[PDB]
Amino acid sequence: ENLKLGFLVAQPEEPASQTQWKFADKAGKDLGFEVIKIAVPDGEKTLNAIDSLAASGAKGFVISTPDPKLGSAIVAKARGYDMKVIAVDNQFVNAKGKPMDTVPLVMEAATKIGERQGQELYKEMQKRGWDVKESAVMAITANELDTARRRTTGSMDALKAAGFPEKQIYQVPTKSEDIPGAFDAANSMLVQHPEVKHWLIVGMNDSTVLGGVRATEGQGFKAADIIGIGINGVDAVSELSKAQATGFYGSLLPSPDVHGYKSSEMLYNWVAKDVEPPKFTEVTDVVLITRDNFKEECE
């Protein structure tokens, strides 16, 4: 009696994780299953929660792994327990760091959120009325990462498609995904292109775009002459909460409510109705938080 399904999140203190749990519970009510919620901040507690789920009689679970390289261990343990597994937000990888494509995955498409970035950059640019002749794109890239590559390519593609001149899009590889690496990359771009008066900053995440913005400050560029939009809002609140407006215009955040609901629904259909999910299930809903709205928006 009464189907039980797990929902495991790495970071239960995060508003987004709490939202995932909320909307999984909503999936449970709507479809008739009980949600067992367990925090999994490390590999030990990850393995424990699975053992715990098995003993409770859960037939499957959704997980946002705290470490992608936990994938093999997760898959093997779940298999011995005959429990269905769906990954949310973070893709599993093997011992060689190649993505495990066998485990169904539910998240935003990296290209699509990249494209959304390029669209919003161009929209903020058109709004400010920059002369496109004295303007350019600084794309800080980490192309050896697949998700970064797809974000920055998507962003640049959307920018090109919206009519930004391909000749004024400049790329620079970052040596690390921190502020420092992005700052070093942004710096070398600024020195190689002083004829530029207005910069659009493309990058894969908040931290990358922020290194961008920080480097432009050091070179005397004003906020009004710099547009950068982050992805996933890791730094968005503190930066947008500042007294003054900066070159960091906003951030793109995938909707955790849809991630939570949809993953749970796919898991239920698998377990209760024997409908195997596809390898990848794209969730599109993405919100832009700016200074103007991050109060009402981070509700």
Domains plus CATH for the chain?
1-108+255-285 (3.40.50.2300), 109-254+286-299 (3.40.50.2300)
Q: What kind and span of H or E run contains 145?
A: none
Cβ burial of 89 (10 Å; 0-12, 13-18, 19+) is: buried
CB of 5 closer than 8 Å to CB of 60: yes
Q: How far apart are CA 129 and CA 74, in angstroms?
A: 52
Distance CA 88, CA 103 (A): 10
Tally of residues, the chain: 299
Cα 265 off chain centre by? 21
Q: How far apart are CA 263 and CA 180, in angstroms?
A: 35
Contacts of 55 (CB under 8 A, 6+ apart): none
% helix, strand, coil for the chain, step of 5: 45, 20, 30
Per DSSP, what are the bridge partners of residue 4? 34
Question: What resolution does the deposited structure have, in angstroms?
Answer: 2.2
Q: How was this structure determined?
A: X-ray
| CA terminus-to-terminus distance, the chain | 37
Contact criterion met (CB below 8 Å) for 269 and 104: no
Burial class (CB in 10 A: 0-12, 13-18, 19+), 75: middle
Q: Residue 287: beta bridge partners?
A: 253
Q: How far apart are CA 92 and CA 176, in angstroms?
A: 21
Contact (CB, 8 A) for 152 and 114: yes
Q: Look at residues 55, 85, 82, 88 and name the one whose alpha carbon lies nearest to residue 72.
A: 85
